[PDB]
Point group: C4
Chain length 210, copies 4
Amino acid sequence: KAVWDWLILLLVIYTAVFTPYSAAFLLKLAVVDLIVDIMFIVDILINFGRIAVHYFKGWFLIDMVAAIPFDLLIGLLKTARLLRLVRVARKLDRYSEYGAAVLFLLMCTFALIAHWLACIWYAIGNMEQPHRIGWLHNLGDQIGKPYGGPSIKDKYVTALYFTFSSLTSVGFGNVSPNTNSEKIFSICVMLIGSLMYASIFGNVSAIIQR
Amino acid sequence: KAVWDWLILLLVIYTAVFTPYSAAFLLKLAVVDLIVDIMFIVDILINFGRIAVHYFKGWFLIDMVAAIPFDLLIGLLKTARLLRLVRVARKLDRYSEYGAAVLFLLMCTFALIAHWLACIWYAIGNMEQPHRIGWLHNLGDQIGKPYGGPSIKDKYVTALYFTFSSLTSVGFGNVSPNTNSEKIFSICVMLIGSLMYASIFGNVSAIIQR
Amino acid sequence: KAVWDWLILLLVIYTAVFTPYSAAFLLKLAVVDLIVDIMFIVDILINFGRIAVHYFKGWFLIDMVAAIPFDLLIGLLKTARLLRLVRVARKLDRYSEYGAAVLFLLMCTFALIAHWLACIWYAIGNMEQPHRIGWLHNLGDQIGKPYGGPSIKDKYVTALYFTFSSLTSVGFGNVSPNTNSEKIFSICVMLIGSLMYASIFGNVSAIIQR
Amino acid sequence: KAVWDWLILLLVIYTAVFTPYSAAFLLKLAVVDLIVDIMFIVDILINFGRIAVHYFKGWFLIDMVAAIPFDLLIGLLKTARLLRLVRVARKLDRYSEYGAAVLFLLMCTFALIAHWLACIWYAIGNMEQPHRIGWLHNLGDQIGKPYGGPSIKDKYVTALYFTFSSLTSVGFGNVSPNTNSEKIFSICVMLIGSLMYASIFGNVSAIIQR
């Protein structure tokens, strides 16, 4: 039970890494998804004589709708598995005991936000690709893979690197927005970064200053 | 009167967004402008029998000149409506109790500063076109507009994105100053961007812990 | 007496702005410089029988050399007037009586550091005349004035803009170091600019609250 | 004894500068490092009978492995000498007695982190070169030394300048990551640089006033 919370947190991080990635890139492992689904079913069963009503009156519908699959584009309904991130929100008291723990959580949420923004950036670039101005075409031209096109590894790495440069306000200039939708996404990313980078690294400076 | 105060704040935001955009881009719907003008006249009437003398010798001498229609260049003279921004700067106590409202107002005024700088940047760029040097010519080249140049949407989005990149100290390298006017404007933008970035984001970091 | 010190501050700002500029650029008006010298001699004269020995044992040794003419490559010795900058390094207690004065002084010294680094950058770019490599050639190609070469206005504006971008960590990419001397100078600029940016803007964020 | 340990710190900085540099670049005079290791052996002898056994039970192994010559991948074994950096890592209570000394050590450790990251970057470039995607090819194209190729001076200066730009979040755009290995290394460098920049410069801003 004491170590079960950390396992649940690790599974939540795994699903928050691999659900947006799968939806954005792989839609176009299954056994691991089945295993984590079984583990989350075990956890929701564990969460439950007089405590049943208490759990029913709060944070039961969310877990019930998250655990049950939508397996009857039917694969897009699997994006609802992101609701499991609320579990770490309702148990933040146990995860905030150690300064190392909260520092690792801050780095993890920085990486998670960067990964989600990379998934959105790739989705935009792919939805604009069939309709030589987007970032995918320039990236393919600059790595010797003219549009075929770059591999999934190259596309994901480029998107994550661009998102990290935009969030950290580096702007290497290798890849830059060139379409109106890309420019608006970049502006929104600039606002999001200016907020979250400032807040998170202020918290980090507070932690180290302790 | 609180609902009226927040409605007046919304109208002030609307005019601060749409009069400099109009002056910069549109010059070479009216129903919304007429409705907002009527609402501001209603507000100045509501502002007022003992307090009438008090308000007459106060902000009335500014509100009257900010509300008089100049329909006797009229398009350039309509910029005097920017004096309505003092209607919210004189009642900071009304908009400083929610806590999150302060953060929202700070982020909104950051966006408004970016929008005003974008309007000034477009005004600088457009006045240099008749004279491939300049941000407008390069922007048209990037998309494929033989500057028949880019549409108003593309020009505004590019200007806003460049201003946000300069203010956030990213420097994407897609849009860069090349003329001495643009270079001096960018130096001034860098100075005021450092100022506003430091002050505003130190403030928001201050409230983020509360 | 009170007015005299602020006038001396204005004069020292003038000389700190126009001595490095003249040395860096105009090596290849005099009446204003002569009037400035007259005022500085007047200041040394008023700076004075009991206190005469006190001043003689104090700052007189450094003050006298910085103001006596070195008239006889002979113009390279003119930089001696830069030693007058310490005259305002001893009346901080009088120049910091108002917070707005502190803010103005901080922005003035930031701009002065940018100006001095721009002069050094131009000297570095101009000493590389014997040998497409270098910022001056790139700038001359950018603004459509191939080497001849860009005017002094364009060269100074480009140098100041590059120095400001380096100090504020924007990195527009219009001008980038491309030579070993330029790269080493840029590394030193990055180090000192990060240090002074952090210090100055932390102090500024402290000032705005106070 | 103070001068002895200050010389210890100086030679520790020397080896931290010159061992990774040699390992990365100079692989293909030794008198300086010969005297340095002789001096380290003399320090070991000085450190040593009541306290000799106590210190033997303590750190004796650390300066035993990092001092014994490996003369007999064969030449790469000298990288074990970087373990001498912990000699100053056990005397922070003494090396942090002065605020100016603290700032000097912070600047030195920032420069050392940049130097180590530049060595790693150059090692990546060299292992990728024989396989224009690499940064070394682009560097050779920029300067007048097309691939032969740039000399060791140019390569090291470019690596250090790029690493400093990445850490300081400038993004000059002259040299930018272009391969998957370079992009991943740049993401890691962005994270590391953000963290260390925040911590170190928060500390520095905490020292400037005092």
